[PDB]
């Protein structure tokens, strides 16, 4: 079923893009909590 890739393709490319912009600030939140 090729369609499960197609439906998840924008969900994947959004999360990896959102976590690209937030990784310098998601690490700093993890650091002061650790």
């Amino acid at each position: 079923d090729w369609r499960v890739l197609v439906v998840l393709l924008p969900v994947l490319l959004a999360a990896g893009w959102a976590v690209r912009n937030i990784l310098p600030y998601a690490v700093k939140q993890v650091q002061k909590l650790l």
Partner: protein, 34 residues
């Protein structure tokens, strides 16, 4: 100075992520013909 991922962040995204997915699905449904 504020954190980014809280319980509130999870509570927001458990609603908002499927909502935007469903609204895209329901928008596509307006173009189906019998």
């Amino acid at each position: 100075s504020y954190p980014i991922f809280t319980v509130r962040w999870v509570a927001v995204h458990t609603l908002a992520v499927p909502t935007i997915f469903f609204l895209g699905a329901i928008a596509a449904m307006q173009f189906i013909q019998r």
